[PDB]
Design a protein around this ligand. Sequence first.
Ligand SMILES: *C/C=C(C)/C=C/C=C(C)/C=C/C1=C(C)CCCC1(C)C
Ligand code: NA
Length: 269
Amino acid sequence: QELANFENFIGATEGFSEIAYQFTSHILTLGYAVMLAGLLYFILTIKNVDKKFQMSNILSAVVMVSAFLLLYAQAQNWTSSFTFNEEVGRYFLDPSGDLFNNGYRYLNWLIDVPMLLFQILFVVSLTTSKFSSVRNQFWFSGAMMIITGYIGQFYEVSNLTAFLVWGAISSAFFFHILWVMKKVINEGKEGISPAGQKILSNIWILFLISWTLYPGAYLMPYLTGVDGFLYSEDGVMARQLVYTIADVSSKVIYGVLLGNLAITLSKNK
Ligand SMILES: *C/C=C(C)/C=C/C=C(C)/C=C/C1=C(C)CCCC1(C)C
Ligand code: NA
């Protein structure tokens, strides 16, 4: 079966029900729509925070631009890649199209991950850690996590062993990032108001959950085993839903909370 991602595989073999095709289209559209809304939010509220914090708002806005453009591209790629067959009454991979391509999302991650990790360092103050050290660790492990993930996904269909091994390597970098971010949160909570500490607690939980959704969605088609319930259009729907929840959470909600933290920090006098 010529296609080499899971979406194309399902599209070429079983096809997508009307519901699966339309749901996925709508959730991807909601994704980019929220980023555009977020972009305007972060621009318009930039004056609500003190100058010293504004780099966080700037980085949120730039993340919104990248996410809007690339998630818009991904959404159009979805609808362009699958076309209705009247005889069967399902949507199949269109040989006339460009085929579904995970590249848009992975590029978004490569760009956004370093900016999301960076931006908290303009709101919290470290204690015993160095800014440059934390930044460098975030950026190195962030890049390596996405690169190794991207290598992995090439083997999603063709070599489950490679897919899982590269995934595990990627997960090692992810665990490093979690370790560093937890340290940043802990140092950030030192020497701020309890209201600020509460927001940071919430940021940590949001970060932990929203970022873990990504490897969840990576594994999704296989979480019920091969020829499992999720090894299907339902796995495709679940993956894209989970990615979209993760995107809104990790980018928009995260940015909103950091803005709220910045506002709170200024209230001590
Ligand atoms: C706005 C986009 C963000 C915050 C993207 C984050 C992406 C990840 C945390 C990806 C993690 C992965 C693993 C930990 C293992 C499987 C491969 C990845 C790349 C999905
Ligand atoms: Na179509």
